[PDB]
Curated annotation (Swiss-Prot), chain A:
The lineage of its organism: Bacteria, Thermotogati, Deinococcota, Deinococci, Deinococcales. Photoreceptor which exists in two forms that are reversibly interconvertible by light: the R form that absorbs maximally in the red region of the spectrum and the FR form that absorbs maximally in the far-red region. Also has a slight blue shift for the far-red maximum. Could also absorb green light. May participate in regulating pigment synthesis like the carotenoid deinoxanthin which could protect the bacterium from intense visible light. It comes from the Bacteria. Residues 23-91 form the PAS domain. In the N-terminal section; belongs to the phytochrome family. Contains one covalently linked tetrapyrrole chromophore. Lacks the cysteine conserved in plant phytochromes (at the position of Met-250) that binds chromophore. An engineered sequence used for X-ray crystallography forms a thioether link to biliverdin through Cys-21. The natural sequence can bind phycocyanobilin and phytochromobilin in vitro, but the identity of the natural chromophore is unknown. A tetrapyrrole binds at C21. Residues 143-307 form the GAF domain. This is Bacteriophytochrome.
Amino acid sequence: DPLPFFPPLYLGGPEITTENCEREPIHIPGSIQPHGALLTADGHSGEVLQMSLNAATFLGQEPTVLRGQTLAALLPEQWPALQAALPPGCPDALQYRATLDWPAAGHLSLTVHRVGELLILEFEPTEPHALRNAMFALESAPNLRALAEVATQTVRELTGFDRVMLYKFAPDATGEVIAEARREGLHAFLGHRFPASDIPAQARALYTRHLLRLTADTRAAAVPLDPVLNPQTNAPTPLGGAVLRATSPMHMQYLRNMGVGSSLSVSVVVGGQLWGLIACHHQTPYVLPPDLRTTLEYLGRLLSLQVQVKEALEH
Amino acid sequence: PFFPPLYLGGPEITTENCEREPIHIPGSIQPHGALLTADGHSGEVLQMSLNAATFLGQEPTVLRGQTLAALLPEQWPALQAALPPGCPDALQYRATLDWPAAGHLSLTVHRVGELLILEFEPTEAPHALRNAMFALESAPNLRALAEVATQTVRELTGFDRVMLYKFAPDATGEVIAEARREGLHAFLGHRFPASDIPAQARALYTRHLLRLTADTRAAAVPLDPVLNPQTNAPTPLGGAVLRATSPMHMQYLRNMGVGSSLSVSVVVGGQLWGLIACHHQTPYVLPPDLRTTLEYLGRLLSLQVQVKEALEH
Ligand SMILES: *C/C=C1/C(=C/c2[nH]c(/C=C3[NH+]=C(/C=C4\NC(=O)C(C=C)=C4C)C(C)=C\3CCC(=O)O)c(CCC(=O)O)c2C)NC(=O)[C@H]1C
Ligand SMILES: *C/C=C1/C(=C/c2[nH]c(/C=C3[NH+]=C(/C=C4\NC(=O)C(C=C)=C4C)C(C)=C\3CCC(=O)O)c(CCC(=O)O)c2C)NC(=O)[C@H]1C
């Protein structure tokens, strides 16, 4: 039965069990994963409102100094570019990316998107023809099976992940591993099927709009935003568009129970519906840098197109 | 059918037989790169472009005996695996060579039956592609998508004019969006007949998705031999981007005052929906890595055109 979200934990909401699976508000956890930092800022003035508690250590500045400046002063070269790329009223799915040379922290990748009157800024550390070669190989795959196999093998070669699966949704939202590339010694999940609440309904809707999400370390504690609520609204900060957002502890426990230290996936979206997932597992924690993740994002789109094409060749 | 090519004493092309020109077998290439053909098994260099000596820095005869194994040691096994016998002519493999005579070359290979076609071009060596991809996806409708696409391509390439050209059901064309330098005519809104991109050219554009004329006044460079030794027949160059451009089509770029051109096919439901069409007033060799960006954009636009057309119908 579909039911509306519970309030999050920090607003006195209940804790999450196998009973109320589908009512965790996973998009507003009030916290992020510790391998990057996040700031929120007023979309018109550029006043800095919220920051992750670890921000001082990524950005090399005291909180009170950060919060006491506008983005115009903090990001003089990027602030006008942000404002042109992310105009008021734009969708929350639109992202702008730049690379910064920050004194204390080396090269940072900056990813920005806009939710209403809020700008959300994510900072992460950042670092030949493999993509072009893959694009052509995907297109020349003769059928859906060969496409799925080429796609899994390519992603594994690009990333070094211990396990890469193509996970397809059935009409009842059960899923099934239809191809996989895996490290020697791992057991096969190929052909296994798994029940529909394994990826509950409120996450499949979010996976149709925001096409990539990851857990870099399934044992890492989440880092709170400070303050936790958006001071504009005294309400929760929407983080469904932020790859840094903390992952639910109900999902983190499952990966732990499977022996997974790191988990990523790209959505494959066909005709406006979530067709499947390029799912990746690593047994140890593992951070895939932003520019490599971009390659996977591009492959997500290519695969969406090629899945349509291969399936049309099939009636 | 097709007329024989000129160099096999076929008729010269007119505006009376626009549909029968063998645009795929001209026997020559554009001079900003070099092409070798080679045997699929032996790696034996069978044809070369008369200009190969320039790019490769090799005494002419040296090449036309040697083997790819010898000539490209690191690459030759990769090719063997990347382009297995029986693969499609559409499948391409690329690498960057740090080659003694020329700082860096791009190498592009595909296979047509028993022949490997190798293309060499000068090359080199950020977020504009990722930023463009998200911009295309958030365009609210087909019109805005067209506008974003043309603007994005112009910004990435510096081309004097970038259009989105859309085919009607009878192959009548229509510039539905345009991004252009100040002080050019505006082709926005105009339509042009179905003969302006003939039938056999649209068929090839359905399979091989990117083509360009780098300099509309440059002479083609012959293949030597012109005929493939294997077959004593013309080498199919349809999948080569260095392939010499129809003289009928450069005469039309010249009459328009264009010195450089490039298009990307937008393919939807197995059919040619339209092209991203770029103009430059002067000669312009777009480097391979930037062309790759446009090739990606072509696929992304193909996806988004279907998405956007579905939310009208
Ligand atoms: C009572 C709640 C439950 C629950 C919560 C939950 N699950 C997800 C997301 C995922 N669950 C997946 C399950 C699988 N992992 C595998 O490896 C396989 C098969 C080989 C299956 C069936 C997967 C793949 C996901 C997607 C995440 C990813 O791939 O990286 C969420 C959403 C997480 C978020 O947005 O933060 C939630 C809340 N899962 C359950 O099984 C029940 C106990
Ligand atoms: C007697 C035949 C004619 C002919 C031949 C021809 N045309 C092409 C390909 C193209 N023709 C195009 C025509 C236009 N260029 C424009 O800028 C506009 C409108 C603003 C039109 C209508 C275009 C765009 C192409 C695509 C090629 C490209 O974009 O670079 C070919 C094939 C060339 C090849 O494969 O190398 C041929 C043989 N064109 C005519 O107009 C008639 C007279």
